[PDB]
Design a protein around this ligand. Structure first.
Ligand SMILES: Nc1ncnc2c1ncn2[C@@H]1O[C@H](COP(=O)(O)OP(=O)(O)NP(=O)(O)O)[C@@H](O)[C@H]1O
Ligand SMILES: Nc1ncnc2c1ncn2[C@@H]1O[C@H](COP(=O)(O)OP(=O)(O)NP(=O)(O)O)[C@@H](O)[C@H]1O
Ligand SMILES: [Mg+2]
Ligand SMILES: [Mg+2]
Ligand SMILES: [Zn+2]
Lengths: 346, 97, 284, 597
């Protein structure tokens, strides 16, 4: 980084604001109206938790993966393009346009050295960056199963043509999909509507569902906003930041702050997790596993990093639990959600 | 020690006791009054006194007439060499420095 | 016995002066090294393996630069011992090594075994033990510093009025190492020095400090220690002995007085609130 | 020049004094001469090498160490000459047949900090450097001249004892005593030495983001030959030097090698004997395996038996029996399968980890390809060849193609690889264990569908000694315990500041090379009577069912239990297996394969 004294001074001064979370969240994909949950989820994934290796023999990843699913015409494809623009070391790819070998790594007869050589694919070339996928529903299944190692073990292992080696794959994956038959049905759970297997579904930290609505006042506000946007960009909540200020803020926070988890309430999380897992067994909308606990630790560290704090505190743990449970309730059938919401009162 | 006597046969105990009786008779007769215990002074002598450290909790140890010392673990004493020698061999004490 | 950079990070005085628990402090440290003209590659190498041209004149460079920066007191009067071809020690290295052997945290049998190892290491025939003790000391110093940083950033030090109060809590970094009175008292002294150098509030810079730490949670007990006010020319006299006794008796506290210094005691955890109220009201 | 010769002579004297006067110890115990004694003992055994340490020399005289750091090529030969003349007076007079004095190689060692390849500023030309890395390529051995003689073609004049420089540089002959190229070398009078070359790769964690790893060329000489192989992590000490109009290549001349990881010392044997002696060693080892992972004690026990292995046998009519053990784990997602594979690869003395989705038949066993030099076809070793004698971890096992899983059927049973391609026919060795992980066909185990969860064919399921099914379970008490365990594991990453992995690694290697068991007669009788019951039960289950099962019971399972009994006996260094060992072996097999069947 090459930030001036004035840059770090303004960046650090902004952290004093008690409402900084609203300013950062409201500044993601600014021209898209509504959709608060999507902006919040993308923000946490943009800053990220911290990797660690307790005792040297037990490494675990830092990155937070995201999946979006829902009805057509709801700005899903637009969000990925914004993420591609604001972040650095970003790659974008679509469905049938990608192969297993292109996603991971490939082998070739080298043009001038005249020997077999190995070269990087998308997940290796991205490295400590963002890997964006679109039309995730429409890949060939034999191509989609290539990313399982890179998403969790964060490496790519290859053994071909006399070569035996492994490569780094330290990236964040974001994906967008469509529901079966083109429209989501609230009479069915997420798993029934998406058609992806459990080893895939369990590798995403944040899951979102987007739906059409028919309120006339909301239609009028959305339409008026879009018309306003068109007259605004002719060639010619709180107030958001300029995009260059936000870019400076992100690159500072990822390089100069490293949150420590010095203590937290084990009894509270353990009780909540056991109760949650028991209910997950009942409805079967999504299965809940050990990965969920580690995911909440990542989200807590990410919220700590947004406030430029070196140590995690009680507020961060509460934020992580809220995000986790709010995204979980949407997985259920419409008639069940009321009882589930009252069960997990927070 | 009882842990080691567990492996011997009855006739072997008979043999061992006979051997002790006869050997003790020989040493007592060597000369003077009550002879010489030749089972000691196994190494050539360098000094009169040695410093010893206790490895095990052990009972009372008598040094001369009514005087005694208590062998509690990691207590440490300075004693004449000829009194400590067998306890060092059996593994109760350690010769430091 | 380690790199120049490690010494500057882990010494109590320079760590307080440059505020090295904060990332801005690291920039200040680099400015200091730049003024001396030490390459960073030299500074990260072990002292024994540094370039001989720099080693011969180091003490003058460091004193001159330190004096310019306002650190007026970098030299001390001391002694050193040398024997054989390559065994050399300053009088303080022996102290930290011996102290670390004696107060070792591991429950490697009874505590007397640690005492025995400390005593034996003072003879020249047992030199390997001295070299082992130095390695224990390095870890001890590092643990101390990250504890102090955690304590300040989490903002555990709190004014009660007539004294500053602070407490550690279970599971957090290296708390087992500070269960004994020796290590606990020395930690608390370094903590107070760090705090007084940090803060600008004048009313905070002249106070004593009381620190509490877990002793045995299965007994429900905590160790408590009090320090006199921090000033350079202080007589090192302190009054917390009679203060603790009077406060405990007025409170009818369940407590025990065990260590040979009168400033450290043992308390039942449930009594700590009323005991602190008695101390605050007694010191007034 | 005479001044130069005088300076050389003076420096040689100073090195000689260092070798023959240096001592260690104290007057409170007694002194010993470190390097004199080593020269004597090594020379009397026919070694002709020593390993001098920079820390010692620097303490005896700082100037000599300074010179040997800034001008190594110029001064190291004075040290080698000094070592030779000291060896002579330390051993002389020698018996009949020994009267001629041999040449000594001097190696260097130090305690100072390394630097990465990227740190090599070109200011370091000819200076002494210390570098870490991975060996990625290694040549076969060659012969290199040290001194030669030559003769003239036209008039048969000669020149003799012509000295040749070490390292990767050549030489040119005279033209006087005639034609323009008048001299030729006499091969019968060439004093030659072994020599080899290697290529080094910069450490994965040292290279920044957004750059390539650098790589470097190494030269190796005399006693250093065939000391390492590719893939190893090593620390190197050597001289750094050079070998568009202005380009020239560069390389490092090695002077010492340290494998970052040798024969066991007597003290180490006493500790291993103690470990073998103490009575509950099986539980101790079981707790050392993958200590962070909660639960799964039976699975950890089976992994221990895999690492120690059975025993190899050659029978009187010349046939072989394989000894080593294969293991498979199959079931639900999020149950720590990949973590156990990742641990076993580090715990084993020899190990390799690969993904089933990212590998090919020719890459697993062996390959044939044309030489980048010459025009000939040459052989290459796959994963199962590199891991000969060790463990192979195959992750994502259910995502290989059918025709690729077929390729390892010879290697898993007959422990050899037969090749016939391109006009070459040979047999290669692969004596290694397979450890594999997989999911159900339906992503997680579906108890309503029964046997359809598995679609591996019987000819590969029967080549595993044990098969485990892992199912996730929603019990509240276990969930609360596991949650607390996970949270404290994360929290204690700072706070942290029974057998260790390094200790266990050396212990495993020692037990494997020294001890080979056999069954006691009654133990074989007991196992025999059990096997008949087991076969009868399996037959009745298939007869009752409308469908044949995927996991058969065959003579391979009878051999499997024997291999586990031998492994259990090996942990205790006992020459015979017993009924207690057969009981535990039967218990382990009873849990895994009969739950799967
Ligand atoms: N809330 C909104 N605000 C602004 N533009 C919107 C909004 N919703 C939809 N649009 C516009 O609708 C168009 C389609 O956007 P897109 O991101 O492809 O939606 P989508 O749901 O992903 N369509 P699809 O890919 O077929 O599922 C773009 O021009 C968007 O800008
Ligand atoms: N018992 C456990 N102890 C500690 N971590 C666990 C445990 N069980 C699961 N995990 C966590 O589970 C996550 C995934 O581990 P992994 O090794 O891939 O399990 P897996 O069975 O191989 N999952 P999958 O590859 O989808 O079949 C990691 O973050 C582990 O830390
Ligand atoms: Mg779209
Ligand atoms: Mg896995
Ligand atoms: Zn001629």
């Amino acid at each position: 980084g090459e930030l001036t004294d004035e840059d770090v001074k303004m960046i650090t001064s902004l952290s004093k604001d008690q409402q900084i979370g609203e300013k950062i969240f409201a500044s993601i994909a600014p021209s898209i109206y509504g959709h608060e949950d999507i902006k919040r989820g993308l923000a946490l994934a943009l800053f990220g938790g911290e990797p660690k290796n307790p005792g040297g023999k037990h490494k675990v990843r830092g990155d937070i993966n995201v999946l979006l699913c829902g009805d057509p015409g709801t700005a899903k494809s637009q969000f990925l393009k914004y993420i591609e623009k604001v972040s650095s070391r970003a790659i974008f790819t679509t469905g049938q346009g990608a192969s297993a070998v292109g996603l991971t790594a490939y082998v070739q007869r080298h043009p001038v050295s005249r020997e077999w050589t190995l070269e990087a694919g998308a997940l290796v070339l991205a490295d400590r960056g963002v890997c964006l996928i679109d039309e995730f529903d429409k890949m060939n299944d034999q191509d989609r199963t290539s990313i399982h190692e890179a998403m969790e073990q964060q490496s790519i292992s290859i053994s071909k043509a006399g070569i035996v080696t492994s490569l780094q794959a330290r990236c964040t994956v974001i994906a967008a999909a469509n529901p079966i038959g083109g429209r989501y049905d609230p009479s069915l759970t997420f798993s029934e509507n998406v058609d992806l297997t459990e080893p895939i579904i369990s590798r995403f930290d944040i899951l979102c569902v987007v739906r059409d609505t028919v309120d006339p006042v909301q239609d009028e506000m959305l339409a008026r906003f879009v018309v306003g946007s068109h007259v605004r960009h002719h060639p010619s909540g709180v107030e958001p930041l300029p995009q260059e200020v936000l870019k400076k803020y992100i690159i500072y926070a990822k390089e100069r702050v490293h949150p420590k988890l010095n203590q937290m309430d084990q009894d509270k999380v353990a009780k909540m997790y056991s109760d949650l897992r028991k209910e997950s067994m009942a409805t079967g909308s999504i299965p809940i596993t050990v990965r969920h606990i580690e995911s909440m630790i990542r989200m807590a560290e990410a919220h700590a990093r947004i406030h430029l704090r070196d140590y995690v505190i009680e507020d961060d743990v509460n934020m992580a639990i809220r995000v986790m449970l709010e995204s979980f309730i949407d997985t259920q059938k419409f008639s069940v959600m009321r009882s589930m919401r009252k069960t997990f009162a927070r | 020690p009882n842990a080691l006597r567990f492996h011997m046969a009855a006739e072997e105990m008979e043999w061992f006791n006979n051997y002790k009786r006869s050997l003790a008779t020989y040493m007592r007769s060597l000369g003077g009054d009550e002879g010489l215990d030749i089972t000691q002074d196994m190494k050539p002598p360098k000094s009169l006194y040695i410093e010893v450290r206790c490895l095990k909790d052990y009972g009372e140890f008598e040094v001369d007439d009514g005087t005694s010392v208590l062998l509690k673990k990691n207590s440490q004493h300075f004693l004449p060499r000829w009194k400590c020698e067998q306890l060092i061999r059996q593994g109760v004490l350690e010769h430091i420095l | 016995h380690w790199s120049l950079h490690d010494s500057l990070c882990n010494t109590s005085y320079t760590a307080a002066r440059f505020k090295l628990w904060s990332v801005h402090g690291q920039k200040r440290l680099q400015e200091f090294l730049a003024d001396m003209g030490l390459p960073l590659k030299q500074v990260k190498q072990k002292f024994q393996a540094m370039d001989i041209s720099l080693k011969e004149n180091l003490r003058e460079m460091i004193e001159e630069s330190a004096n310019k920066f306002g650190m007026k007191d970098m030299r001390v009067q001391t002694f050193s011992i040398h024997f054989g071809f390559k065994h050399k020690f300053l009088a303080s290295d022996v102290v930290f090594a011996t102290m670390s052997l004696m107060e070792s945290p591991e429950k490697d049998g009874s505590g007397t075994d640690h005492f025995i190892q400390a005593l034996d290491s003072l003879s020249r025939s047992n030199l390997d033990k001295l070299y082992h003790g130095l390695e224990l000391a390095k870890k001890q110093l590092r643990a101390t510093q990250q504890t102090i940083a955690s304590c300040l950033c989490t903002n555990l030090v709190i004014s009660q009025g007539p004294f500053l109060y602070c407490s550690l809590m279970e599971g957090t970094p290296d708390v087992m190492l500070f269960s004994r009175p020796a290590s606990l008292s020395l930690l608390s002294k370094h903590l107070l020095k760090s705090f007084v150098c940090s803060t600008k509030n004048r009313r905070c810079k002249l106070l004593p400090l009381v620190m509490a730490a877990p002793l045995s949670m299965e007994h429900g007990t905590v160790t408590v220690v009090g320090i006199p006010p921090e000033t350079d020319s202080s007589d090192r006299k302190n009054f917390f002995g009679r203060a603790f006794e009077k406060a405990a008796e007025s409170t009818s506290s369940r407590m025990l007085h065990n260590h040979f210094d009168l400033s450290v005691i043992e308390l039942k955890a449930e009594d700590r609130s009323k005991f602190l109220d008695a101390l605050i009201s007694l010191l007034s | 020049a005479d001044e130069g010769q005088a300076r050389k002579s003076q420096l040689q004297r100073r090195f000689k004094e260092f070798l023959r006067q240096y001592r260690v110890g104290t007057d409170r115990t007694g002194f010993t001469f470190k390097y004199r004694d080593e020269l004597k003992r090594h020379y009397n055994l026919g070694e002709y090498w020593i390993e001098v340490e920079m820390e010692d020399l620097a303490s005896f005289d700082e100037d000599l160490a300074d010179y040997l750091y800034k001008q190594p090529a110029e001064h190291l030969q004075l040290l080698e000459e000094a070592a030779k003349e000291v060896a002579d007076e330390v051993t002389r007079p020698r018996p009949s047949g020994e009267e001629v004095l041999q040449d000594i190689q001097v190696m260097l060692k130090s305690d100072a900090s390394p630097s990465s390849i990227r740190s090599l500023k070109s200011d370091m030309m000819s200076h002494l450097v210390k570098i870490p890395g991975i060996i990625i390529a290694a040549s076969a051995v060659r012969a290199k001249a040290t001194r030669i003689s030559i003769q003239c073609r036209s008039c048969r004049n000669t020149l003799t004892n012509i000295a040749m420089r070490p390292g990767l540089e050549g030489y040119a002959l005279p033209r006087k005593c005639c034609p323009l190229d008048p001299y030729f070398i006499m091969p019968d009078k060439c004093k030659c030495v072994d020599f080899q070359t290697l290529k080094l790769q910069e450490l994965p964690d040292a290279v920044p983001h957004g750059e390539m790893p650098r790589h470097m060329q190494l030269y190796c000489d005399r006693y250093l030959c065939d000391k390492v192989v590719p893939g190893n992590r090593v620390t190197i000490m050597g001289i750094y030097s050079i070998k568009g109009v202005g380009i020239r290549s560069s390389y490092i001349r090695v002077l010492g090698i340290q494998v970052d990881t040798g024969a066991v010392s007597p003290q180490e044997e006493e500790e291993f004997r103690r470990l073998a002696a103490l009575p509950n060693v099986y539980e101790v080892i079981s707790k050392s395996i993958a200590p962070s992972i909660f639960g799964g004690t039976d699975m950890k026990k089976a992994i221990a038996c895999l690492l120690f292995g059975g025993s190899r046998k050659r029978l009187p009519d010349g046939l072989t029996r394989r000894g080593d053990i294969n293991l498979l784990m199959l079931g639900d997602p999020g149950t720590a399968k990949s973590q156990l594979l990742k641990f076993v690869e580090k715990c084993s003395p020899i190990g390799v980890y690969t993904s089933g989705k990212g590998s090919s038949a020719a890459g697993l066993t062996a390959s044939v390809m044309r030489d980048p030099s010459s025009r000939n076809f040459i052989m290459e070793g796959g994963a199962m060849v590199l891991a000969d004698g060790g463990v192979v971890c195959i992750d994502e096992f259910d995502k290989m193609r059918e025709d690729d899983r077929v390729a390892i059927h010879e290697a898993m049973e007959q422990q050899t690889i037969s090749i016939a391609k391109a006009g070459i026919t040979t047999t290669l060795n692969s004596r290694c264990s397979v450890l594999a992980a997989a999911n159900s066909v339906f992503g997680r185990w579906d108890e309503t569908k029964g046997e359809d969860n598995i679609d591996f064919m019987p000819t590969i399921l029967s080549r595993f000694d044990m098969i485990f099914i892992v199912k996730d379970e929603h019990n509240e008490e276990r969930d609360v315990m596991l949650a607390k365990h996970v949270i404290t594991l994360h929290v204690s990453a700072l706070t942290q500041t029974e057998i260790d992995l390094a200790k266990l690694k050396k212990f495993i290697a020692y037990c494997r090379v020294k001890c080979g068991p056999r069954l006691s007669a009654e133990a074989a009788e007991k196992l025999k009577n059990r096997y008949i019951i087991m076969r009868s039960g399996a037959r009745q289950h298939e007869r009752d069912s409308d469908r044949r099962s995927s996991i058969p019971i065959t003579v391979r399972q009878l051999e499997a239990i024997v291999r586990i009994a031998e492994a259990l006996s090996k942990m205790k260094l006992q020459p015979f297996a017993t009924e207690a060992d057969v009981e535990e072996a039967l218990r382990l097999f009873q849990v895994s394969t009969l739950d799967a069947a």
